[PDB]
Amino acid sequence: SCSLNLQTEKLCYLMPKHIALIMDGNRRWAKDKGLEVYEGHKHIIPKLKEICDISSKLGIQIITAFAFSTENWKRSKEEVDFLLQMFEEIYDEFSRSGVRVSIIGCKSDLPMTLQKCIALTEETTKGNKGLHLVIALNYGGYYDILQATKSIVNKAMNGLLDVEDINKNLFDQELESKCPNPDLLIRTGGEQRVSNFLLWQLAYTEFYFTNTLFPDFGEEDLKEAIMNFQQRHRRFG
């Protein structure tokens, strides 16, 4: 059965509280400087830290950043190997910062070195009360919905819930990215797609696509995206 006409609520009841980031344009950035792809990749973590510090001053509370999609597993070993090595630098950039860092995604597929850096990073930052950075590493929208579905099937087979208890709120509590959902998605590098980043979480998100390449994306670029977000609310709010 189904019924939508008496279903009120809404998930989790002018500045965007939560920004989702697709950090694209780094390979393109390297190629048009005549640099190896690896020189572009090296900009990702330090640029993400720079955006966190700017965002924290503007009163943004959450950033979810798409660091490593499941599609990365389809590139040359050397490129994957570079990238999985490179993300250990999350410890160096964030462990002694004022940013609270969580990772979402399938940790088990990552080298135990990366797994332990990730675990150390979450542990040392867990007490920071400023911006919460969620880093999506080996993460997909399909993955999040499937791991949630599996969790609900387990609960049902152990008599913890009835099919009639399955609703927006119950499902949401089982996802790795939970509401409050992103108010604004920013994608750099010119593509106008979400590339299986978040699916469930983007239902009411404002989409902002810029041709700016991630390594050129600075405080000015961010304030422009936010002012655009504010004019959309005056027009459609």
Swiss-Prot record:
It comes from Solanum lycopersicum. Uses dimethylallyl diphosphate and isopentenyl diphosphate to catalyze the cis-prenyl chain elongation and produce the 10 carbon product neryl diphosphate. It is found in: Plastid, Chloroplast. Belongs to the UPP synthetase family. Expressed in leaf trichomes and stem trichomes. The active site is at 24. This is Dimethylallylcistransferase CPT1, chloroplastic. It catalyses: isopentenyl diphosphate + dimethylallyl diphosphate = neryl diphosphate + diphosphate. Keywords: Chloroplast, Magnesium, Metal-binding, Plastid, Transferase, Transit peptide. One of its GO terms (cellular component) is chloroplast stroma. The chain holds residues 53 to 299 of 303 of the full protein. Its cofactor is Mg(2+). GO terms for molecular function: dimethylallylcistransferase activity; magnesium ion binding; prenyltransferase activity.
